[PDB]
Motif scaffolding. Structure first.
Motif, PDB file in Angstrom:
ATOM      1  N   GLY A   1       2.498   1.977  -3.344  1.00  8.54           N
ATOM      2  CA  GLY A   1       1.315   2.467  -4.152  1.00  8.54           C
ATOM      3  C   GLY A   1       1.586   3.940  -4.101  1.00  8.54           C
ATOM      4  O   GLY A   1       1.302   4.766  -4.987  1.00  8.54           O
ATOM      5  N   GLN A   2       1.931   4.580  -2.899  1.00 10.43           N
ATOM      6  CA  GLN A   2       2.045   6.123  -2.855  1.00 10.43           C
ATOM      7  C   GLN A   2       3.242   6.503  -3.423  1.00 10.43           C
ATOM      8  O   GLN A   2       3.071   7.456  -4.310  1.00 10.43           O
ATOM      9  CB  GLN A   2       2.151   6.341  -1.125  1.00 10.43           C
ATOM     10  CG  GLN A   2       2.384   7.772  -0.998  1.00 10.43           C
ATOM     11  CD  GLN A   2       0.874   8.401  -1.159  1.00 10.43           C
ATOM     12  OE1 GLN A   2      -0.223   7.783  -0.850  1.00 10.43           O
ATOM     13  NE2 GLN A   2       0.826   9.541  -1.478  1.00 10.43           N
TER      14      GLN A   2
ATOM     15  N   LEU B   1       4.176   5.261  -6.214  1.00  9.67           N
ATOM     16  CA  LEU B   1       3.922   5.213  -7.815  1.00  9.67           C
ATOM     17  C   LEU B   1       3.060   6.369  -7.935  1.00  9.67           C
ATOM     18  O   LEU B   1       2.923   6.862  -8.980  1.00  9.67           O
ATOM     19  CB  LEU B   1       3.279   3.860  -8.026  1.00  9.67           C
ATOM     20  CG  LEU B   1       4.037   2.577  -7.699  1.00  9.67           C
ATOM     21  CD1 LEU B   1       3.311   1.569  -7.837  1.00  9.67           C
ATOM     22  CD2 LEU B   1       5.243   2.639  -8.518  1.00  9.67           C
ATOM     23  N   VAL B   2       2.233   6.713  -7.085  1.00  7.99           N
ATOM     24  CA  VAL B   2       1.121   7.922  -7.152  1.00  7.99           C
ATOM     25  C   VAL B   2       1.870   9.159  -7.248  1.00  7.99           C
ATOM     26  O   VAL B   2       1.427  10.167  -7.990  1.00  7.99           O
ATOM     27  CB  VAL B   2       0.134   7.739  -5.942  1.00  7.99           C
ATOM     28  CG1 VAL B   2      -0.666   8.971  -6.035  1.00  7.99           C
ATOM     29  CG2 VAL B   2      -0.618   6.793  -5.897  1.00  7.99           C
ATOM     30  N   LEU B   3       2.954   9.112  -6.593  1.00  7.06           N
ATOM     31  CA  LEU B   3       3.865  10.702  -6.614  1.00  7.06           C
ATOM     32  C   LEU B   3       4.770  10.531  -7.696  1.00  7.06           C
ATOM     33  O   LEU B   3       5.689  11.360  -7.893  1.00  7.06           O
ATOM     34  CB  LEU B   3       4.515  10.455  -5.273  1.00  7.06           C
ATOM     35  CG  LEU B   3       3.762  10.665  -4.142  1.00  7.06           C
ATOM     36  CD1 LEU B   3       4.509  10.772  -2.763  1.00  7.06           C
ATOM     37  CD2 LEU B   3       2.748  12.078  -4.149  1.00  7.06           C
ATOM     38  N   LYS B   4       4.578   9.568  -8.767  1.00  8.09           N
ATOM     39  CA  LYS B   4       5.374   9.736  -9.969  1.00  8.09           C
ATOM     40  C   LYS B   4       7.062   9.652  -9.575  1.00  8.09           C
ATOM     41  O   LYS B   4       7.808  10.541 -10.029  1.00  8.09           O
ATOM     42  CB  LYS B   4       5.156  10.902 -10.778  1.00  8.09           C
ATOM     43  CG  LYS B   4       3.869  11.122 -11.338  1.00  8.09           C
ATOM     44  CD  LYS B   4       3.717  12.473 -12.069  1.00  8.09           C
ATOM     45  CE  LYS B   4       2.424  12.458 -12.652  1.00  8.09           C
ATOM     46  NZ  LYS B   4       2.308  13.771 -13.768  1.00  8.09           N
ATOM     47  N   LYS B   5       7.419   9.119  -8.612  1.00  4.33           N
ATOM     48  CA  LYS B   5       8.628   8.985  -8.110  1.00  4.33           C
ATOM     49  C   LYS B   5       9.066  10.246  -7.614  1.00  4.33           C
ATOM     50  O   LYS B   5      10.515  10.635  -7.557  1.00  4.33           O
ATOM     51  CB  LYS B   5       9.634   8.503  -8.963  1.00  4.33           C
ATOM     52  CG  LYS B   5       8.958   7.319  -9.866  1.00  4.33           C
ATOM     53  CD  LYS B   5      10.037   6.542 -10.854  1.00  4.33           C
ATOM     54  CE  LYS B   5       9.444   5.788 -11.836  1.00  4.33           C
ATOM     55  NZ  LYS B   5       9.382   4.272 -11.405  1.00  4.33           N
TER      56      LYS B   5
ATOM     57  N   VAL C   1       0.812  -1.211   0.114  1.00  7.73           N
ATOM     58  CA  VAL C   1      -0.048   0.152  -0.107  1.00  7.73           C
ATOM     59  C   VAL C   1       0.810   1.215  -0.063  1.00  7.73           C
ATOM     60  O   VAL C   1       0.544   2.220  -0.479  1.00  7.73           O
ATOM     61  CB  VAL C   1      -0.865   0.059   1.269  1.00  7.73           C
ATOM     62  CG1 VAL C   1      -1.956   1.139   1.167  1.00  7.73           C
ATOM     63  CG2 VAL C   1      -1.625  -1.343   1.447  1.00  7.73           C
TER      64      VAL C   1
ATOM     65  N   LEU D   1       8.341  15.224  -3.161  1.00  5.63           N
ATOM     66  CA  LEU D   1       6.951  14.999  -2.895  1.00  5.63           C
ATOM     67  C   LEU D   1       6.995  13.894  -1.941  1.00  5.63           C
ATOM     68  O   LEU D   1       6.372  13.806  -0.805  1.00  5.63           O
ATOM     69  CB  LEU D   1       5.860  14.877  -3.829  1.00  5.63           C
ATOM     70  CG  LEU D   1       5.914  16.287  -4.609  1.00  5.63           C
ATOM     71  CD1 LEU D   1       4.954  15.845  -5.733  1.00  5.63           C
ATOM     72  CD2 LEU D   1       4.892  17.186  -3.797  1.00  5.63           C
TER      73      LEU D   1
ATOM     74  N   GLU E   1       8.464  14.522   1.726  1.00  5.77           N
ATOM     75  CA  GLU E   1       7.690  15.537   2.408  1.00  5.77           C
ATOM     76  C   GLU E   1       6.315  14.705   2.752  1.00  5.77           C
ATOM     77  O   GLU E   1       6.078  14.822   3.810  1.00  5.77           O
ATOM     78  CB  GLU E   1       7.401  16.681   1.355  1.00  5.77           C
ATOM     79  CG  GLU E   1       8.322  17.974   1.716  1.00  5.77           C
ATOM     80  CD  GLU E   1       7.548  19.156   0.926  1.00  5.77           C
ATOM     81  OE1 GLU E   1       6.760  19.166   0.250  1.00  5.77           O
ATOM     82  OE2 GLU E   1       8.181  20.355   1.238  1.00  5.77           O
ATOM     83  N   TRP E   2       6.053  13.784   2.001  1.00  9.08           N
ATOM     84  CA  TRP E   2       4.844  13.060   2.368  1.00  9.08           C
ATOM     85  C   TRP E   2       5.146  12.111   3.416  1.00  9.08           C
ATOM     86  O   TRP E   2       4.346  11.894   4.464  1.00  9.08           O
ATOM     87  CB  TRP E   2       4.393  12.392   1.086  1.00  9.08           C
ATOM     88  CG  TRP E   2       3.179  11.382   1.576  1.00  9.08           C
ATOM     89  CD1 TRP E   2       1.517  12.057   1.621  1.00  9.08           C
ATOM     90  CD2 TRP E   2       3.071  10.128   2.173  1.00  9.08           C
ATOM     91  NE1 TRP E   2       0.930  11.253   1.923  1.00  9.08           N
ATOM     92  CE2 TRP E   2       1.591   9.723   2.525  1.00  9.08           C
ATOM     93  CE3 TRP E   2       3.616   9.201   2.319  1.00  9.08           C
ATOM     94  CZ2 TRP E   2       1.304   8.650   2.896  1.00  9.08           C
ATOM     95  CZ3 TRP E   2       3.506   7.818   2.907  1.00  9.08           C
ATOM     96  CH2 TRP E   2       2.465   7.322   3.323  1.00  9.08           C
TER      97      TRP E   2
ATOM     98  N   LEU F   1       9.135  -3.470 -11.687  1.00  7.79           N
ATOM     99  CA  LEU F   1       8.329  -2.275 -12.491  1.00  7.79           C
ATOM    100  C   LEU F   1       8.852  -1.556 -13.683  1.00  7.79           C
ATOM    101  O   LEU F   1       9.847  -1.096 -13.472  1.00  7.79           O
ATOM    102  CB  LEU F   1       7.898  -1.422 -11.418  1.00  7.79           C
ATOM    103  CG  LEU F   1       6.873  -0.437 -12.009  1.00  7.79           C
ATOM    104  CD1 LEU F   1       5.579  -1.172 -11.996  1.00  7.79           C
ATOM    105  CD2 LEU F   1       6.910   0.770 -11.117  1.00  7.79           C
TER     106      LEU F   1
END
Lengths: 47, 89, 89
Positions: free
Chosen positions: C47-48, C50-54, C44, C58, C61-62, C89
Motif C-alpha cells: 500500500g505504501q 501505491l501511495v507513493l505513485k511508484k 500494508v 520517494l 528514501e521512505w 494491478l
C-alpha cells in the motif's frame, strides 16, 4: 505542534511546489517526513 | 446496496490507471478533493485502504475527514475497494 | 538481479496475508522494523508503494529512512512490488 506541523495540507503542498520538491499524498502517516524535507531545504536558504 | 455498474465493473476487471472518480462511492466532486490531496489515480486511493489494514472505522473517518464523504458513500468505497482486494488480493 | 526465488514466487501467485518479511529485499531484521512501524503484513507495505505513485526516489528514501535498508535492498522491493502490480494491478 511543530512550526511546520501548524501548516495545513493545502499550505504544505504549495510550499513544496515553491521549492520544486517532488511529493506524493500528504497524510499524518507521511506528513512528518514532508515536514522534515521542507526543513532541510529551508535550512539551506538560511545558510 | 444499489451500487452503480462501476462497482461490479471495477471488481470484474483490473483497475489499470483509471481516474480516482472511477472508484464506486467517489463522485466527481469527491474525486476532486482526493485529487487535490495527491490522489490523482484510483490505485493511490486503494493504497490508503491497504495502509489502514482494512480498518473500516479508520477508513471511513479518513475518507470523511479527508473529503467530507457521507457515511453512505464511504460504505460503497469500503466494500468496493475491499471486494476488489478479495478477487485481486 | 539475483533476487531470491521469493521474488518470482511473489509475482507468480497472489500475496494473500503473507508476512512483511516475505517481500523480496525485506529481511527478517528489516521486516521487524516495518512491523514496529505498523506494517505487520506485506499488503500494508505494498500500500505504501501505491501511495507513493511508484516514485522510486520517494519509495527508496521512505524505506531507507523508515528502516535503514541499503540502496541495494530497496531496489529489490521496488522491482518486486512493482512487478507484482504489473501482474496483479
Amino acid at each position: 505542534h511543530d512550526n511546520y506541523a501548524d501548516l495545513s495540507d493545502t499550505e504544505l503542498t504549495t510550499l513544496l511546489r515553491r521549492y520544486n520538491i517532488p511529493h506524493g499524498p500528504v497524510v499524518g502517516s507521511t506528513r512528518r517526513l514532508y515536514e522534515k524535507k521542507i526543513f532541510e531545504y529551508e535550512t539551506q536558504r538560511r545558510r | 446496496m444499489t451500487t452503480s455498474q462501476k462497482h461490479r465493473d471495477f471488481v470484474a476487471e483490473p483497475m489499470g490507471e483509471k481516474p480516482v472518480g472511477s472508484l464506486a462511492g467517489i463522485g466527481e466532486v469527491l474525486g476532486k478533493k482526493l485529487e487535490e490531496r495527491g490522489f490523482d489515480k484510483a490505485y493511490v486511493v486503494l493504497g490508503q485502504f491497504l495502509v489502514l489494514k482494512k480498518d473500516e472505522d479508520l477508513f471511513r473517518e479518513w475518507l470523511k475527514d479527508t473529503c467530507g464523504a457521507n457515511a453512505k458513500q464511504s460504505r460503497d468505497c469500503f466494500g468496493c475497494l475491499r471486494e476488489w482486494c478479495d478477487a485481486f488480493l
